Scaffold this active site. Structure first.
Site, PDB file in Angstrom:
ATOM      1  N   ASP A 163      -5.477  -2.619  -1.380  1.00 59.32           N
ATOM      2  CA  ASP A 163      -6.713  -2.957  -1.357  1.00 59.32           C
ATOM      3  C   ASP A 163      -7.071  -3.372  -2.912  1.00 59.32           C
ATOM      4  O   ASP A 163      -7.752  -4.302  -3.075  1.00 59.32           O
ATOM      5  CB  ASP A 163      -7.100  -1.651  -0.701  1.00 59.32           C
ATOM      6  CG  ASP A 163      -6.385  -0.419  -2.325  1.00 59.32           C
ATOM      7  OD1 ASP A 163      -5.379  -0.361  -2.599  1.00 59.32           O
ATOM      8  OD2 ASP A 163      -7.000   0.747  -2.242  1.00 59.32           O
ATOM      9  N   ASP A 208      -1.101 -11.889   5.720  1.00 56.56           N
ATOM     10  CA  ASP A 208      -1.937 -11.720   6.885  1.00 56.56           C
ATOM     11  C   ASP A 208      -3.393 -12.115   6.090  1.00 56.56           C
ATOM     12  O   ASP A 208      -3.842 -13.110   5.910  1.00 56.56           O
ATOM     13  CB  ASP A 208      -1.872 -11.587   8.460  1.00 56.56           C
ATOM     14  CG  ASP A 208      -2.743 -12.090   8.992  1.00 56.56           C
ATOM     15  OD1 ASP A 208      -2.741 -12.849   9.095  1.00 56.56           O
ATOM     16  OD2 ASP A 208      -3.150 -11.347  10.356  1.00 56.56           O
ATOM     17  N   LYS A 260       0.947  -1.041  -0.196  1.00 57.14           N
ATOM     18  CA  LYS A 260      -0.113   0.037  -0.044  1.00 57.14           C
ATOM     19  C   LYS A 260       1.222   1.529   0.385  1.00 57.14           C
ATOM     20  O   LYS A 260       1.224   2.259   0.444  1.00 57.14           O
ATOM     21  CB  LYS A 260      -0.523  -0.358   1.495  1.00 57.14           C
ATOM     22  CG  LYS A 260      -1.595   1.042   1.575  1.00 57.14           C
ATOM     23  CD  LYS A 260      -3.014   1.118   0.276  1.00 57.14           C
ATOM     24  CE  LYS A 260      -3.770   2.215   0.560  1.00 57.14           C
ATOM     25  NZ  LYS A 260      -5.073   2.651  -0.757  1.00 57.14           N
TER      26      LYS A 260
END
Lengths: 416, 416
Positions: free
Chosen positions: B283, B307, B230
């Site tokens: 995302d 994760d 990100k």
């Protein structure tokens, strides 16, 4: 330079009295065209909104659109380096309600997200992302219709605060020395050539967000509010958000323990319905939205998790390009297309205007113009059911009639 | 207290020479039963692995299992407060290869994740999560078979470092004063009653992880390596991970620009195949794994994103309870069941032993015992295709024969 914004001659400014918007019949609404495909989707949204307004109130109400600037077009209007003019922040705050197409941020100049800048500068602490399925939408999952959620993503804190220092910079070294020498930190695996980011989470920031989520569940008679967090690893930020969220439910909404915990039941003061307040760890939650979507409704979470959750949900219902969104604060609100700028198609009248149009539906609803909002939802549902759609949908289905961006806006109007 | 571990009389220790494991025909393998359902799944895994080993090598090879402790059982063996004995860390490092059932961490004592503790203490910097679809598995998506990915999740840094201070603590205040007064930080929205977390990302940590991912793509002739991050919001940690990952591909593997960038092509030195090195924002990546899963293969990402990605992928292929996992470092490796402890069913011989069994398949492969590993995959594929499965699968299908945990282990053996 003087302002290049033109305040509409007819048109009146929306005001706020007691946390309640007072909307005239001729409200002035600032809009930002947006970078890239904003050039295609914004005019479609303006036409669709005007038609819904016209049809709902028979001419008694009319929006006076006022163009304001941010992004590439802003530099074209205000000159080199004016990506987000102060007047834009002033105008959104003054006129209370505004809408924008997509925006991207230039790279190479050390400028941070223009979307995040708008949110933080205007203190629009709620990023509201409702996600539902529109019948007829091509979806990658077997039962997208089971998804009907509303995400309240915290918009003012978390790692998005943009507090970080570059690997090997004097500042990063200074921060790392402080951590290691003054805070006795021993957990940094490689302290050299190490970038450092700061993640803040506060009681006030958490509670104003969760308060809004619970008030929304009450106002719309939703079934539950789920606090999503990764508190088992980040105890003092994510775990604190969860703790503070349950605390707020108990302190302000009379939440009480369900069975042996940890869930709470909050009674809807208007319907007497019992709203469940629960929590789910973020990684498991990304599995649960796919496996048991019907068990979730209103979601309250931090900035980063909300970004991920909103996107994952939009994709699962086939709505990657038609997902509505709002950024709401106590003094103003900014509705927005939620997809990117897709420059490869910009100006071709090709892309789906569905996201900015549904964000305009949220805007109208926010203004209390629920009839015009319902007409947009009705129009969107009928156009998609008719299989008269833009390429992004058409290419995934059989028997569809392909329409241009502008044409799909007309199809929405045709189905009102 | 003296050790309560019993080193197998027959059995020899695996050794490491030049980053290459030297595995005897009678290796001693430490295993941790695990909390909760570990009591059900571990014995099933031991029996299934022994059968695969026996069938593949006709009796010439045999594992000498050695029970070691961590979690609730460790406190039962070593006494109050011994959740993770030093000897367990010593033994995994000494014997090089080990496996464990699920573990949970007690709450209320200020103890951090026992799973993360094992990873960090042993410096097992690679969390390896391969995700594929097993024909016949009930899945929430329309085309789970299109998913065939391998996730290399960085396991030693990121916000998992566990560096954070509680809201209102003297330390948090001290840190916030330093940030605000000495670093001139002005971006903390609410500095009071504010929890603070630190997110480190280093060049060395990033590169050892990405290096392993690229070597894995080469060794297994995979098509691409995608750096997921990100970085558009976290420029110096997530963005740095991406930059360092592409840099490593150029510096060590001859990666060169594809077209106008940003992707690189790395030539497989063994097959001459061109491996694509690309990147996707986190995302958008959670949307892409659902919308275009066939375009992704090997993934390299930071601890937190890994994760989330691992979990999201496992759920989409219907593999929430049969997802294998490994934690690999330069000196040892710890294979593990990847689901939780499910105490409500513990001891009932009910749950799916598939995850720990497939993690044992990865362990056998890691040991170079690929024939025994292939027999487990074959057994798992046939049992699931036979629709002879545990309740978690059975309940989602029609025409299945319900089996106990132990019985499904037998079905796997029956299908070898």
């Amino acid at each position: 330079m003087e302002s290049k914004v033109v305040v509409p001659a007819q048109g009146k400014k929306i005001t706020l009295q007691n946390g309640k918007l007072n909307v005239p019949e001729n409200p002035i609404i600032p809009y930002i065209e947006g970078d890239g495909i904003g050039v295609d989707v914004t005019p479609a949204m303006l036409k669709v909104v005007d038609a819904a307004v016209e049809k709902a109130y028979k001419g008694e109400r009319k929006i006076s659109w006022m163009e304001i600037y941010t992004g590439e077009k802003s530099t074209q209007v205000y000159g080199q380096d004016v990506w987000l003019p102060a007047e834009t922040l002033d105008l959104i705050r003054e006129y209370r309600v505004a809408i924008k197409g997509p925006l991207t941020t230039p790279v190479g100049g050390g400028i941070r997200s223009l979307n995040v800048a708008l949110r933080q500068e205007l203190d629009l602490y709620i990023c509201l992302r409702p996600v539902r399925y529109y019948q007829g939408t091509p979806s990658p999952v077997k039962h997208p219709e089971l998804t009907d959620m509303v995400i309240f993503r915290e918009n003012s804190e978390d790692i998005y605060a943009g507090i970080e220092w570059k690997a090997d910079s004097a500042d990063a070294e200074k921060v790392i020395k402080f951590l290691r020498e003054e805070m006795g930190v021993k957990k940094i695996r490689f302290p050299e050539h190490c970038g450092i980011g700061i993640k803040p989470c506060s009681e006030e920031g958490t509670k104003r967000l969760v308060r809004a989520a619970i008030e929304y569940a009450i106002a719309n008679d939703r079934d539950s509010v789920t606090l999503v967090h990764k508190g088992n690893i980040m105890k003092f930020t994510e775990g604190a958000f969860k703790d503070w969220g349950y605390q707020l439910a108990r302190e302000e909404f009379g939440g009480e323990l369900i069975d042996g915990g940890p869930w709470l039941k909050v009674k809807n003061p208007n319907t007497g319905k019992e709203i469940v307040i629960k929590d789910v760890i973020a990684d498991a939650f990304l599995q649960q939205i796919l496996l048991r979507p019907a068990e979730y409704d209103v979601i309250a979470c931090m900035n980063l998790n909300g970004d991920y959750i909103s996107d994952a949900l939009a994709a699962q219902v086939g709505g990657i390009g038609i997902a509505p969104g709002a950024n709401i604060g106590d003094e103003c609100a900014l509705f927005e297309a939620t997809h990117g700028t897709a420059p490869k198609y910009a100006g071709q009248d090709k892309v789906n205007p569905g996201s900015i149009i549904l964000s305009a539906e949220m805007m109208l609803r926010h203004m209390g113009w629920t009839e015009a909002a319902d007409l947009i939802v009705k129009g969107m549902e009928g156009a998609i059911n008719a299989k008269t759609v833009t390429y992004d949908f058409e290419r995934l289905m059989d028997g569809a009639k392909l329409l241009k961006c502008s044409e799909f806006g007309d199809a929405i109007i045709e189905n009102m």
